[model samples]
Target chain A: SVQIVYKPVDLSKVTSKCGSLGNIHHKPGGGQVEVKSEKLDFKDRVQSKIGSLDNITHVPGGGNKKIETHKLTFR
Target chain B: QIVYKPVDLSKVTSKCGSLGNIHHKPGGGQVEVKSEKLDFKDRVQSKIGSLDNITHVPGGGNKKIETHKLTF
Candidate 1:
């Protein structure tokens, strides 16, 4: 005669150590926060008119040099 | 008595610059750049000294337009 016996193999301990990984997602990327140089120019005559628009006083330099300037363009 | 099973199912797709066409803005693409902002309308309007009542000039065209059609 023979007897058979079974005991619960502690699955909780195995699972706690090696748990399923949570959901992970990735989005395609190539988007940018690009800052670029934007060259701008105004005619000599329009310098005065453009002054009213401001932010361009520094455009025209003294004498021979014409009204020309450039600034950053955040894109 | 009972049994259980699982299943799963699952399931997008597009430039420019020039003197006559001033595009001094950054991030502009695929074209030419400009020199000045203000335009002398009269100067540009009369690019040619004169035009006949009925003038004809030979045409220049884009090959991509024709080439694509040919390839297609």
Candidate 2:
């Protein structure tokens, strides 16, 4: 079984640490993270995962227009 | 077996330990650290690798996605 670990985080600290690394932000109802891949599935994975997180409302970006937030699993 | 350093994605109630680093972003995404040594390759591959399961629509949302940028 995959474990979903939860920890309380301060937004400011995260931005301070990684904001310079890239553009990371909580766009009100949406949280934006940089995702790149030749596969469209990868993009969908990020969008779905973020939207599925607690207290997040998933918005359709394209295609299925669903939110993904499943635990990480390996084959 | 792959040795993993636990990195907590959320910072809500993590035990303050020097062994691992915890990072939480406000937008609702999170990442954690288990020990001083971070397997960046494993972490990114694990998460980004999951992208293999995603499906995209043609001419959808800019046509290309940046996966490397999301690694925490």
Candidate 3:
């Protein structure tokens, strides 16, 4: 699974743009949202355009598993 | 510019301890190394069976675009 987290300047705008992609949720209060998808193409679609959301944070889950957190950006 | 081309595994070697290696000589090539981390990523994506079975693992600030085979 691929997970991307971002702080959209406008939540409603971002939601409307990316809502059709996958499961999107707001993180508590504000300033952040997470979108999780099983589709690898989703990552490609997101990254190919947004230059700011290029950094990936790799987290090691329990039992030697790996999880990557990617920054998401919308223009 | 980002360029994606077919690479021959038979002609390249490992580098950077684990990262993919670049060719040494002039006009040399680069090779993707299949390491433990890469294997894990590949396996997980395979199990998920998503994206038309095309797995894109992160590496060297770039994404794995595709795989192909050519015979000459």
Candidate 4:
């Protein structure tokens, strides 16, 4: 079976709870929020966020860095 | 009915970036790039850059959402 995937126009435009564009922050037990794009497909945007968030794994040689899944709520 | 399925990195086969031939668009005066590289790591920064400038057009309900595609 063949499938096609479309890439988002711009991801940097997406903002997260950490801060503005380009800065994504994650904290232990800290709630995070991401600013969605007004031009992208709502579902696509959500999927992207989920993918990025899910890949948040621990830094190979780090302290307390893990792929923390925060409760996501869209506005 | 099937619920929403996530974007599969494994399925994505093509890749692009923002550091290729620069094209000047009319009216909007925006900068665009054409690239042939598909490696996620190499294109990560450029991908992020594109995401930074994304503006929701029409079609999807996602607003202020940032989308990035990386093939693993």
Chain A: TM-score in each model: 0.17, 0.15, 0.16, 0.18
Per-candidate DockQ versus the true complex?
0.02, 0.14, 0.01, 0.01
Better of 2 and 4 by DockQ: 2
TM-scores of all predicted structures: 0.14, 0.13, 0.10, 0.13
Q: Number of clashes in model 2?
A: 23
The residue-by-residue lDDT of candidate 2 on A1-75, one tens digit each, is: 666666545443212222234344544444655656565455443644432424554433332333435455556
Candidate 1 runs further than 4 Å off = A1-19, A36-75, B1-72
Q: Second chain TM-score per prediction?
A: 0.14, 0.15, 0.14, 0.18
Best by TM-score: 1
Candidate 1 residues B1-72, lDDT tens each? 434334434220001232254333332123233545655755464333322233333233223211222221
Q: Write the per-residue lDDT of candidate 4 for residues B1-72, one digit (tens) a residue.
A: 545557654432334343445543322222346777666755365442241324333333333444755553
| lDDT by residue for model 4 (A9-35), tens | 533342224223433444333224455
Best by DockQ: 2
Model 2, runs deviating above 4 Å? A1-28, A36-75, B1-18, B28-72
Question: Candidate 1 at residue A65, lDDT?
Answer: 26
* Model 3 regions lying over 4 Å from their true place: A1-30, A42-75, B1-72
Q: What is the DockQ (computed on Cα atoms) for candidate 4? A: 0.01
